[PDB]
């Protein structure tokens, strides 16, 4: 018949100095702390992968639904929550048309050439792995 103690759930800070327990709820209500102006997306992969990424990004912009919305919070949309623009029309694309090493090398060398030679700046590179 042992005592079980309670630890109060810590609150993670958000924008405007507000505190919420769930990162999802705090993000949806007040938003992230710092305001980056957008995501300079870079997509390296197959044309099919690029199209899939663009479609999923456009789906990300608009609000999307969970099956059970109370056990897991909604996603209002990237602009609504984080306040930065990540539209799919501003995607920097790199086409690809020991086996592990060379498959790794293909994407790495494409990203290296795009980061070194290409003028367009990419904040983060979304490696679309073929399946």
């Amino acid at each position: 018949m042992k005592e079980l103690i309670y630890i109060e759930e810590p609150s993670i800070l958000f924008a405007h100095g507000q505190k919420c327990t769930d990162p999802r709820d705090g993000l949806a209500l007040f938003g992230p702390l710092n305001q980056i102006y957008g995501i300079k997306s870079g997509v390296v992969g197959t044309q099919k992968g690029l199209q899939i990424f663009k479609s999923y990004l456009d789906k990300i912009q608009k609000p999307i639904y969970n099956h059970n919305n109370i056990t897991r919070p909604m996603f209002p949309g990237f602009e609504a929550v984080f306040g930065c623009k990540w539209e799919s029309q501003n995607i920097v694309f790199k086409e690809i048309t020991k086996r592990t090493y060379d498959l790794v090398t293909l994407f790495n060398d494409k990203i290296i050439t795009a980061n070194k030679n290409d003028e367009e700046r990419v904040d983060v590179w979304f490696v679309i792995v073929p399946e």
Binding site: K2, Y6, H16, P73, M74
Partner: protein, 415 residues
């Protein structure tokens, strides 16, 4: 008259008011804010008057330090007081104290009478309180904003301070054999014989024989141990080992503690060998389950242990091992063991894994707890405890009821 007005200090407090207005429109309420809805190239004060005394359910005034003494906020507040007197509606003015620096007693004289909706900390909870106040006064698409409402309400449902009781997987060891006896069978035990094959638990330690049994239990398969002098055997009061008192050069306290632990799990194995339950060898231990058709309606008491799903059969099984660190207690681990026809095991383990995850997809705490308690109570020869055989006269006794726990914090069960 169906509109909500929010006055504030313009140069400083914009983020709070913008967020509050956006959430209010998300909730379906019509709002009017000077930094959002006041048009450009328009007489601003005339339009503020028109909105205040023509179309306004409620007049919300942020009570920040600067927003209190501000001339524009004061003017909007004065006109709001006049329209409050005109409309005769109670609680038409709603202050919103959002700054912790200014005291509730330093609020300007026109507002201090009203109860200020707290916004100093946790704007979400203050907004929920404001929403409750709006609903109580019936302040004036259905399935898309109730989600935002429920997220506002559910952001803060800290645990209720109620008493809860919990069953565990730790079954305490009620009683223990008084003496741990090492039998010096230098030759009576063959050096190439396996100590795990004896009908009673025993381990090969030094030149002795670590077991809880008497020196004459191992006779049927090891007859040469007969006529062995009892003075040769060394008996240790194991309560000293449990307390850690016995620490001599012959054997260290942790080593004999481990020896007793090993005795516990292999006596467990031997008992389930005699407890009418089949075995499965996992990575590190043995699980013991019940076959189909061996129990009434495949259930013990009011709890089932074996069932069917998608041309497959599942049995609830247990695998137990002892530890004596906080207390002498045997922990159990529960598993679902799968079969084709209900008696014959599946040789493949990938299909076993997939079936285990599929059946545990819908299993919850009540199901697991009741299955564990029923299976352990089934293996119980005694009404409130189970037996492990370590000797003819020495006994290992395991509590049927887990170590019970309780907590001062709990939750309302979802309906």
């Amino acid at each position: 008259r169906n509109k909500i007005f929010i006055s504030h200090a313009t140069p400083e407090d914009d983020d709070f008011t913008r967020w509050l207005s956006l959430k209010l429109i998300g909730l379906g309420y019509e709002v009017w804010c000077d930094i959002l809805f006041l048009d450009k190239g328009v007489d601003f004060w005339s339009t503020i008057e028109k909105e205040i005394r023509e179309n306004t359910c409620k007049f919300l005034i942020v009570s920040s330090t600067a927003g209190n003494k501000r001339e524009g906020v004061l003017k909007e507040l004065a006109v709001a007081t006049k329209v409050k007197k005109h409309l005769q509606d109670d609680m038409f003015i709603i202050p919103l104290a959002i700054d912790e620096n200014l005291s509730y007693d330093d609020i300007n004289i026109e507002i201090v009478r009203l109860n200020a909706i707290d916004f100093k900390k946790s704007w979400a909870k203050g907004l929920q309180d404001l929403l409750d106040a709006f609903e109580k006064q019936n302040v004036p698409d259905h399935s898309k904003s109730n989600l935002l409402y429920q997220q506002i309400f559910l952001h803060d449902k800290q645990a209720i301070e109620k008493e809860e009781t919990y069953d565990s997987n730790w079954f305490p060891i009620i009683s223990f054999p008084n003496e741990l006896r090492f039998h010096r069978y230098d030759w009576r035990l063959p050096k190439q014989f396996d100590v795990r094959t004896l009908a009673f638990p025993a381990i090969r330690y030094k030149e002795y024989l670590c077991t809880f049994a008497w020196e004459y239990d191992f006779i049927h398969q090891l007859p040469k141990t007969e006529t062995y002098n009892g003075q040769e055997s060394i008996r240790i009061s194991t309560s000293d080992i449990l307390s850690g008192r016995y620490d001599t050069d012959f054997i260290r306290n942790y080593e004999c503690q481990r020896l007793i632990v090993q005795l516990i799990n292999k006596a467990f194995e031997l008992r389930m060998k005699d407890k009418n339950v089949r075995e499965y060898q996992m990575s590190k231990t043995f699980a013991y389950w019940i076959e189909k058709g061996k129990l009434e309606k495949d259930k013990f008491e009011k709890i089932k242990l074996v069932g069917k799903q998608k041309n497959k059969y599942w049995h609830f099984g247990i695998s137990a091992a002892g530890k004596l660190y906080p207390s002498p207690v045997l922990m159990v681990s529960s598993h679902i063991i799968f079969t084709m026809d209900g008696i014959n095991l599946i040789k493949s383990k990938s299909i076993q894994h997939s079936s285990r995850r599929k059946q545990g997809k819908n299993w919850w705490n009540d199901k697991w707890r009741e299955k564990l308690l029923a299976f352990i109570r089934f293996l119980s020869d005694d009404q409130n405890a189970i037996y492990l055989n370590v000797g003819s006269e020495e006994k290992i006794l395991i509590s049927n009821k887990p170590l019970k726990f309780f907590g001062k914090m709990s939750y309302v069960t979802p309906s």
